[PDB]
Amino acid sequence: GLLEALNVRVVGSGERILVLSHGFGTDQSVWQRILPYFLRDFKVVLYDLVCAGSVNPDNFDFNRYSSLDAYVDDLLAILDELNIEKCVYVGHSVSAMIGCLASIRRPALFQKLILLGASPRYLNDGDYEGGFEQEDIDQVFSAMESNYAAWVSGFAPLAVGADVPAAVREFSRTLFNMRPDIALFVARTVFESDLRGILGQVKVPCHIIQTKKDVAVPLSVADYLCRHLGGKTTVEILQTEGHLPQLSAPALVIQLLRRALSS
Template sequence: MSVLKRNNVQVLGSGPATMAFSHGFGCDQSMWRFVAPTFEGRYRTVLFDLVGSGGSDLASYDYTKYGALSGYADDVLEVLDETATGPVIFVGHSVSATIGMLAALRAPERFAANVMVGPSPSFINDGEYHGGFTRADVEELLETLENNFLGWSSTMAPAIMGAPEQPHLRDELVNSFCRTDPDIAKHFARVTFLADHRAELSRVSTPTLIVQSDDDFLAPVCVGEYMHRTIPGSRLAIVRNIGHCPHLSAPSASVDAIEGFLHEVIGDDA
């Protein structure tokens, strides 16, 4: 099967450089609809679904390959090989921010910049590191998901989205979670919430922007500040937003942060 079909790749826009957008857990590429079109006039924009999500080929989901985020990083590089000729600006939300980082560490020449929206290298508290949850919290979350996937989705999705003044977005995320194959979602959740990629942060050489909501229970501000301190030369943009999805609930602020970063880092004045 071609990479383009496997990952349901959509190529839009035009321009000499490419921007690729990758979604978070329980989501799909439609979550970028308020951000990606802003860049279509001057970039070739690439949207895709992680295998197991959205319109991807579910039969391609390999529980061994995707037992670590490195499996998704491999896919990202394959998607870029098919859709881009030069270094790419990669925009990843949540777990995809980490996936993009891992891909850039493997092939730094393929990346002009990384934009990490609501990232977390580890959700679990460890000594002085505060990821937002204890190990017991995460295990309880995963156990609840295992036992009652639809109930977990209906409870967690609104908490993750936040956006108290935009209930339609909370409903959208609930529906997105509930459309995901339960077995794949359970596996991907365990990989996502138990991952720890703090050790890789100091090795990052790609220009990096961290876009952090100022009120996000899943990835609190202290996580963004930790990443900013640890990733050499990174920028941190904290946007006013309740929830983990500022690209949906605060798209203008998110776009402004990305635009400012691109202007500073690669001289994009368009």
């Protein structure tokens, strides 16, 4: 029942497998603007993280999903049930770290990882600029508790970054679709994560796609991933502002993604 519960979709006529995994606050509809342009060369697998509002919250086990490993378990169980033994994986935001952890568990499963808006750690640490202090994320948690709508209206336009009203509308919609207690629980999981230690164990090639101005990911984080991932790594700067460029600048994302995929 995992395929139905996480709204797994297999679409396209291509011969290679492309997996699209979204970040916190949205669902697989975040890929709607770029999805048509990869169905020729790839058979695309999409799914919703267990925390998405489009997933019945009866599936969210707070004990189980206290760790990102449970999200990795879901991803691997989906690919196993689909009999997928090799794929290229695009992970947006937290799904990028989910892909890295999954590649460590299954080194032969992932041919290439494409990290979109990826960060191993959002909290600052000395010269490591993650972009946030504990006071920052504590203010986020406090805002979600006192008034969830007030937090959404502050997070959605700043996450989109650029003045693209259609992208703000879409990201606001999926954020308001999320249950407030789940949003608070999962934000704590992502905001307080630190995967810097396991980056060296990732051996598959990684393509890092970073926007020129991301409120959630400083530029130095993209170069940190480049230097510490244990395999072949390349960094490309999307010439746009925002943390969800597949919504706010799809044409540029399609161009860059086609290059990284040889399509």
